[PDB]
Design a protein around this motif. Structure first.
Motif, short mmCIF file in Angstrom:
data_model
loop_
_atom_site.label_atom_id
_atom_site.label_comp_id
_atom_site.label_asym_id
_atom_site.label_seq_id
_atom_site.Cartn_x
_atom_site.Cartn_y
_atom_site.Cartn_z
N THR A 154 14.16 -6.29 -19.10
CA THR A 154 14.38 -4.85 -19.21
C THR A 154 13.20 -4.07 -18.65
N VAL A 155 12.73 -4.49 -17.48
CA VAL A 155 11.61 -3.84 -16.82
C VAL A 155 12.14 -2.61 -16.10
N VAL A 156 11.62 -1.44 -16.44
CA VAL A 156 12.15 -0.21 -15.87
C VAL A 156 11.08 0.86 -15.95
N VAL A 157 10.98 1.64 -14.88
CA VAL A 157 10.17 2.84 -14.80
C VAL A 157 11.13 4.01 -14.70
N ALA A 158 10.81 5.11 -15.38
CA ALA A 158 11.65 6.29 -15.36
C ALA A 158 12.03 6.63 -13.93
N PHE A 206 9.97 -7.46 -5.13
CA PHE A 206 9.04 -6.78 -6.03
C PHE A 206 8.21 -7.79 -6.80
N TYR A 207 8.85 -8.84 -7.32
CA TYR A 207 8.13 -9.80 -8.16
C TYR A 207 7.30 -10.77 -7.34
N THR A 208 7.79 -11.21 -6.17
CA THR A 208 6.96 -12.05 -5.31
C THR A 208 5.75 -11.29 -4.80
N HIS A 209 5.93 -10.00 -4.50
CA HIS A 209 4.79 -9.18 -4.09
C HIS A 209 3.71 -9.17 -5.16
N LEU A 210 4.09 -9.27 -6.42
CA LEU A 210 3.14 -9.27 -7.54
C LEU A 210 2.74 -10.67 -7.97
N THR A 215 14.26 -12.97 -14.82
CA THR A 215 15.33 -13.11 -13.85
C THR A 215 15.50 -11.82 -13.05
N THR A 216 15.98 -11.98 -11.82
CA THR A 216 16.29 -10.85 -10.96
C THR A 216 17.24 -11.32 -9.87
N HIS A 217 17.84 -10.35 -9.17
CA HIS A 217 18.45 -10.64 -7.88
C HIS A 217 17.94 -9.67 -6.82
N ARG A 227 9.41 6.70 -10.14
CA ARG A 227 9.30 5.48 -9.35
C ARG A 227 8.58 5.76 -8.04
N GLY A 228 7.96 4.72 -7.50
CA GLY A 228 7.23 4.86 -6.26
C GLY A 228 5.85 5.43 -6.40
N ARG A 229 5.28 5.44 -7.61
CA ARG A 229 3.95 5.98 -7.84
C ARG A 229 2.96 4.94 -8.33
N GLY A 230 3.31 3.65 -8.24
CA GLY A 230 2.45 2.60 -8.72
C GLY A 230 2.63 2.21 -10.17
N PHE A 231 3.50 2.91 -10.90
CA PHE A 231 3.63 2.66 -12.33
C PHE A 231 4.30 1.31 -12.63
N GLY A 232 5.19 0.85 -11.74
CA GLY A 232 5.80 -0.45 -11.92
C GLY A 232 4.80 -1.57 -11.79
N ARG A 233 3.90 -1.47 -10.81
CA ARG A 233 2.81 -2.43 -10.72
C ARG A 233 1.96 -2.40 -11.98
N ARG A 234 1.60 -1.21 -12.44
CA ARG A 234 0.73 -1.10 -13.61
C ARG A 234 1.42 -1.59 -14.88
N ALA A 271 0.83 -1.20 0.00
CA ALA A 271 0.00 0.00 0.00
C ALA A 271 0.87 1.26 0.00
N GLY A 272 0.23 2.41 -0.16
CA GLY A 272 0.95 3.66 -0.25
C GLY A 272 1.52 3.97 -1.62
N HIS A 273 1.12 3.23 -2.65
CA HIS A 273 1.56 3.46 -4.02
C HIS A 273 0.37 3.55 -4.96
N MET A 274 -0.69 4.22 -4.54
CA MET A 274 -1.84 4.40 -5.40
C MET A 274 -1.44 5.20 -6.63
C1 LIG Z 1 11.46 -2.18 -10.29
C2 LIG Z 1 10.60 -0.99 -10.70
C3 LIG Z 1 10.07 -1.18 -12.14
C4 LIG Z 1 9.42 -0.88 -9.76
O1 LIG Z 1 8.59 0.24 -10.14
P1 LIG Z 1 8.30 1.39 -8.97
O2 LIG Z 1 7.67 2.63 -9.60
O3 LIG Z 1 9.58 1.72 -8.25
O4 LIG Z 1 7.30 0.64 -7.95
P2 LIG Z 1 5.74 0.98 -7.74
O5 LIG Z 1 5.63 2.39 -7.29
O6 LIG Z 1 4.94 0.72 -9.00
O7 LIG Z 1 5.27 -0.13 -6.60
C5 LIG Z 1 4.43 -1.22 -6.94
C6 LIG Z 1 4.36 -2.17 -5.74
O8 LIG Z 1 5.49 -2.86 -5.65
C7 LIG Z 1 6.29 -2.41 -4.31
N1 LIG Z 1 7.68 -2.21 -4.74
C8 LIG Z 1 8.27 -1.34 -5.58
N2 LIG Z 1 9.57 -1.59 -5.60
C9 LIG Z 1 9.80 -2.62 -4.79
C10 LIG Z 1 10.95 -3.27 -4.47
N3 LIG Z 1 12.35 -3.08 -4.89
N4 LIG Z 1 10.95 -4.32 -3.61
C11 LIG Z 1 9.80 -4.71 -3.08
N5 LIG Z 1 8.60 -4.05 -3.41
C12 LIG Z 1 8.63 -3.01 -4.25
C13 LIG Z 1 5.72 -1.27 -3.91
O9 LIG Z 1 5.72 -1.18 -2.45
C14 LIG Z 1 4.25 -1.36 -4.38
O10 LIG Z 1 3.48 -2.08 -3.52
P3 LIG Z 1 1.84 -1.84 -3.56
O11 LIG Z 1 1.36 -1.66 -5.00
O12 LIG Z 1 1.15 -3.08 -2.98
O13 LIG Z 1 1.51 -0.63 -2.76
C15 LIG Z 1 11.33 0.31 -10.65
O14 LIG Z 1 11.79 0.58 -9.33
C16 LIG Z 1 12.59 0.36 -11.52
O15 LIG Z 1 12.54 0.63 -12.66
N6 LIG Z 1 13.85 0.08 -10.87
C17 LIG Z 1 15.16 0.10 -11.58
C18 LIG Z 1 15.11 -0.93 -12.65
C19 LIG Z 1 15.22 -2.42 -12.19
O16 LIG Z 1 15.75 -2.75 -11.19
N7 LIG Z 1 14.59 -3.35 -13.16
C20 LIG Z 1 14.54 -4.84 -13.11
C21 LIG Z 1 14.15 -5.55 -11.84
S1 LIG Z 1 14.92 -7.21 -12.00
#
Ligand SMILES: CC(C)(COP(=O)(O)OP(=O)(O)OC[C@H]1O[C@@H](n2cnc3c(N)ncnc32)[C@H](O)[C@@H]1OP(=O)(O)O)[C@@H](O)C(=O)NCCC(=O)NCCS
Ligand SMILES: Nc1ncnc2c1ncn2[C@@H]1O[C@H](COP(=O)(O)OP(=O)(O)OP(=O)(O)O)[C@@H](O)[C@H]1O
Ligand SMILES: C/C1=C/C(=O)O[C@@H]2C[C@@H](CC[C@H](C)/C=C\CC1)O[C@@](O)([C@@H]1CSC(=O)N1)C2
Ligand SMILES: [Ca+2]
Lengths: 186, 370, 138
Positions: A89-93, A131-135, A124-126, A97-104, A1-4
């Protein structure tokens, strides 16, 4: 939560919005620096046949009519797994970041893939494992992505033994770092 | 995580470099394999490479680091590779797996030194070396057949089984496009013209490419040219003067079938094709006869496929099915084949990685690349 | 036993067959994958592999456990290489496979790849096992 998330967003392939390709290259290279030649060429490979590069877009910075490239992901088909896609190549500007756009972005990928009959996503990730388990992703096995090939290419194509030496390269990335393979059913 | 960079494909020829990205259907850059140095009379550079040497050729002596398909000047070849990465493709070599091509029968020490330079000087993360003729076969949609690869400096017959060149049967002929150009200069001079300078050689190369052809019956064509002017053609030099050419149009590439035209006591390409097949496994000869693939710029002459069909038929068993395949893009079929090979799912296993190189040294190229 | 070497060569799943064959005095299969091809290698086939005639098998091919093969590269008797690369021959469109043979002081090491496995991977694998055995006087 907190990322509407409040912005209006669309998900569109780079090859259908070529005027945004330079901005998409800026986005990715800001995170992963490599030659601009290589990044532009990589995005220029995008096509309906896969691999394809999806952009998360916002109509305006609410100022004038130039759309913002908010995020990006690359989708590739998977060797011997017709219903799988490899996500890369998953990336948000950085400034968005932190605005919910990565989830979307990730949820939009699922909608896009499922509409085309795909039932499983892999990546893949490390550092971003949670982030991915949360989703809803969980640990899986490695897969091999299918790379771009141009349409024009053919497409036709008794003494005792001495002791033995000392008596998973799939699970490392380019630099010998162990990585998690993740997957999600969609 | 970030996707992996697309592999580079670099096809180094005696005359032309072709370079690009794996999976593309055409090279991004095609440029001359030359290093130039001041003829006589700082200057700006102690040497000039590729398209810069071409632009400044008027004041330069040009050297070809590759002779007859073989690297013979390693310091200048390194300049060519540097020019390929940084000036023509504008990529960073340490970021890309790199597929290189090599001549058939490339000497053992040459392919080791290629490997060493790629990993230690350009720091590529991975590389592979493929035989040029094999790549051309892939580009024709096949993995078994016999390739005739004739470029600017060398001509090879290469029989190939399931993608593997058969070195014991490979034939090499030190006659190719540059010799045909030199021959046309000579016989045009015997017609009353004067083509003798390096600059005039480039003009004659263009004449050769635009007006020459292979006669189906050479002696009959000579009689046709003697009894009327129906085969004569004109060509406009850069200064506006016009020259005319007759039986030189087909005498020039007839050299490929009659190397005595340039003083060589060597079998023609049809005979070397036959000799190559006859050194191959009896069980694959039918497939070789049925899959003769032409590749390289010097196989572009109109009529060459019909002539090969006729000549091979005369040498082969009377019941043998013979087919000559002359793809339209065969100036670039080696590069295209490399683009295909480096794009195959099965190719991932084939790369030599930097770690494999650190473990085993340059001789790893002999285990993994054949 | 020697079958440990076979398990070792087979472990990574790239190869469908493997064997260690003694070629001195009276040749025989020391270890091989049961039910496959190399286990059936004959003394006459071994003699062709290590024999003086290094030319006829280019036009006639050779056999391994009766499986017809075509020779790609032959360095089996050459210093520092001691390897031969082959590709099987088939009928009716059936797949063919890459084979490498390496020669140690007392054995031949044979490997056959699965479908699609590149001959270079198989050669590297076979060369490394042969280097290991040479290291230990074999
Ligand atoms: C990874 C990335 C796409 C996430 O997008 P973001 O804008 O930062 O995250 P969001 O604001 O959309 O958050 C979405 C949800 O995931 C959570 N979240 C975001 N980053 C997280 C992280 N590193 N670890 C755990 N949870 C995370 C948020 O708490 C949020 O939870 P909620 O929707 O239940 O409230 C972004 O941070 C990014 O581009 N990072 C650099 C690139 C990178 O590392 N890419 C590949 C990953 S292998
Ligand atoms: N239409 C054409 N007709 C005849 N010759 C041509 C034609 N086009 C190109 N050539 C000649 O082909 C040669 C270049 O072909 P190519 O690029 O295959 O050779 P290369 O790889 O540079 O040299 P090599 O393979 O011998 O090492 C030149 O001699 C050129 O004049
Ligand atoms: C258009 C073109 C054709 C070519 O074949 O280029 C290659 C490379 C070239 C290098 C010198 C040249 C002046 C530079 C560029 C020419 C490139 O030499 C060639 O022209 C040689 C010289 S005479 C000849 O027939 N081929 C072949
Ligand atoms: Ca060439």
């Amino acid at each position: 939560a907190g990322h509407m998330s409040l912005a209006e967003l669309t998900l569109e392939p780079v090859h259908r919005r070529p005027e945004l390709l330079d901005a998409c290259a800026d986005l990715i290279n800001d995170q992963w620096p490599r030659s601009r030649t290589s990044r532009l060429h990589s995005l220029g490979q995008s096509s309906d046949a896969f691999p394809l590069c999806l952009m998360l877009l916002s109509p305006h910075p609410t100022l004038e009519a130039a759309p913002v490239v908010v995020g990006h992901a690359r989708l590739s088909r998977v060797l011997n797994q017709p219903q799988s896609l490899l996500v890369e190549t998953v990336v948000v500007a950085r400034a968005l970041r932190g605005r919910g756009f990565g989830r979307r972005l990730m949820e939009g990928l699922e909608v896009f893939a499922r509409a085309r009959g795909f039932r499983k996503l892999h990546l893949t990730t490390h550092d971003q494992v949670h982030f991915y388990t949360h989703l809803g992703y969980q640990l899986g096995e490695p897969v091999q992505g299918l790379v771009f090939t141009s349409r024009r290419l053919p497409a036709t194509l008794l003494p005792p033994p001495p002791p033995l030496p000392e008596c998973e390269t799939q699970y490392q990335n380019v630099r010998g770092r162990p990585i998690f393979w993740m997957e999600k059913d969609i | 995580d970030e996707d992996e960079t697309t592999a580079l494909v670099c096809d180094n020829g005696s005359g032309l470099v072709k370079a690009g990205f794996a999976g593309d259907d055409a090279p991004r850059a095609v440029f001359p394999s030359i290093v130039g140095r001041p003829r006589h009379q700082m200057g700006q550079k102690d040497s000039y490479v590729g398209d810069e040497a071409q632009s400044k050729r008027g004041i330069l002596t040009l050297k070809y680091p590759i002779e007859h398909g073989i690297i013979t000047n390693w310091d200048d070849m390194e300049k060519i590779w540097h020019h390929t990465f940084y000036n023509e493709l504008r990529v960073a070599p340490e970021e890309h797996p790199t597929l290189l091509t090599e001549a058939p029968l490339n000497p053992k020490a040459n392919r080791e030194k290629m490997t060493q330079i790629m990993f230690e000087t350009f720091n590529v993360p991975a590389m592979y070396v493929a035989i040029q003729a094999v790549l051309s076969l892939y580009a024709s949609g096949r993995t078994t057949g016999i390739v005739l690869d004739s470029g600017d400096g060398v001509t090879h017959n290469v029989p190939i089984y399931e993608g593997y060149a058969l070195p014991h049967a490979i034939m090499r002929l030190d006659l190719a496009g540059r010799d045909l150009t030199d021959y046309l200069m000579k016989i045009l001079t015997e017609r009353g013209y004067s083509f003798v300078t390096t600059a005039e050689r480039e003009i004659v190369r263009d004449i050769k490419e635009k007006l020459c052809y292979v006669a189906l019956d050479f002696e009959n064509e000579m009689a046709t040219a003697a009894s009327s002017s129906s085969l004569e053609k004109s060509y406009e030099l850069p200064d506006g003067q016009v020259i005319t050419i007759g039986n030189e149009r087909f005498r020039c590439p007839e050299t490929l079938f009659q190397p005595s035209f340039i003083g060589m006591e060597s079998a023609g390409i049809h005979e070397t094709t036959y000799n190559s097949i006859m050194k191959c496994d009896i069980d694959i000869r039918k497939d070789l006869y049925a899959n003769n693939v032409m590749s390289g710029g010097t196989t572009m002459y109109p009529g060459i496929a019909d002539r090969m069909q006729k000549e091979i038929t005369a040498l082969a068993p009377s019941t043998m099915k013979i087919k000559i395949i002359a793809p339209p893009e065969r100036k670039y079929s080696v590069w295209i084949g490399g683009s295909i090979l480096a794009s195959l799912s099965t190719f991932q296993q084939m790369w030599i990685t930097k770690q494999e190189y650190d473990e085993a040294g340059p001789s790893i190229v002999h285990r993994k690349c054949f | 036993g020697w079958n440990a070497y076979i398990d070792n060569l087979m472990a990574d799943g790239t190869c469908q067959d493997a064997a260690i064959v003694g070629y001195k005095d009276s040749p025989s299969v020391w270890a091989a994958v049961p039910g496959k091809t190399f286990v059936n290698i004959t003394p006459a086939e071994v003699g062709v592999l290590v024999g003086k005639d290094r030319s006829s098998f280019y036009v006639n091919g050779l056999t391994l456990g009766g499986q017809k093969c075509s020779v790609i590269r032959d360095s089996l008797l050459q210093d520092g290489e001691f390897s031969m690369d082959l590709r099987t021959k088939s009928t009716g469109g059936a797949p063919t496979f890459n084979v490498t043979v390496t020669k140690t002081d007392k054995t031949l090491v044979l490997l056959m790849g699965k479908e699609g496995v590149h001959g270079g991977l198989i050669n590297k694998k076979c060369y490394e096992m042969a280097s290991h055995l040479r290291r230990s006087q074999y």
